[PDB]
Design a protein around this ligand. Structure first.
Ligand code: ATP
Ligand code: MG
Lengths: 49, 48, 50
């Protein structure tokens, strides 16, 4: 009971992200931006971590 | 309609300069912007 | 025969390089994301020039 949750994701000194923290939602988090915004970069952050 | 407004406003606001606090390493807070539980996370936009 | 071969290859390579370099100016700075232009680079390979 009481499944653990990912609360936040931090990127430090990355291309386009010097210091950025996203607060992960309990149900759904939706990145949105134009092509080249760097969303794949954020998911890359999550996976590589 | 609130959501469909918020998005649009943000789309219009982020084209106007950047926020200098975003390089401070200090996360911004989730300021409430209405009743019913809507929240926003953004530093003040200073450098136009 | 080997000399004639090498000569004809050199001439064909030069002609094709000129054609492609002339064609490159047929592009007008497309705007895609952070990509601002596309170009074709043609260069004789030194490993093959030797
Ligand atoms: N390894 C890399 N080397 C150089 N530039 C890169 C690299 N990875 C990403 N970029 C650039 O960083 C910017 C963001 O790329 P990315 O693929 O993360 O964007 P995106 O908004 O997630 O993409 P899309 O929405 O099309 O999936 C783009 O300019 C991309 O060219
Ligand atoms: Mg992407």
């Amino acid at each position: 009971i009481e499944r653990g949750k990912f609360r936040s994701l931090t990127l430090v000194n990355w291309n386009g992200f010097f210091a950025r923290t996203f607060d992960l939602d309990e149900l759904v988090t939706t990145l949105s931006g134009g092509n080249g915004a760097g969303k794949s970069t954020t998911m890359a952050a999550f996976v590589t971590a | 309609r609130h959501f469909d407004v918020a998005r649009i406003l943000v789309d219009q606001a982020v084209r106007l300069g950047v926020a200098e606090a975003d390089f401070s390493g200090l996360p911004a807070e989730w300021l409430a912007i209405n009743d019913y539980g809507a929240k926003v996370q953004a530093h003040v936009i200073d450098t136009y | 025969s080997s000399k004639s071969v090498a000569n004809i290859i050199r001439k064909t390579i030069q002609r094709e390089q000129n054609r492609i370099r002339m064609l490159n100016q047929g592009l007008q700075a497309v705007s895609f994301g952070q990509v601002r232009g596309v170009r074709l680079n043609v260069n004789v390979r030194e490993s093959h020039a030797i």
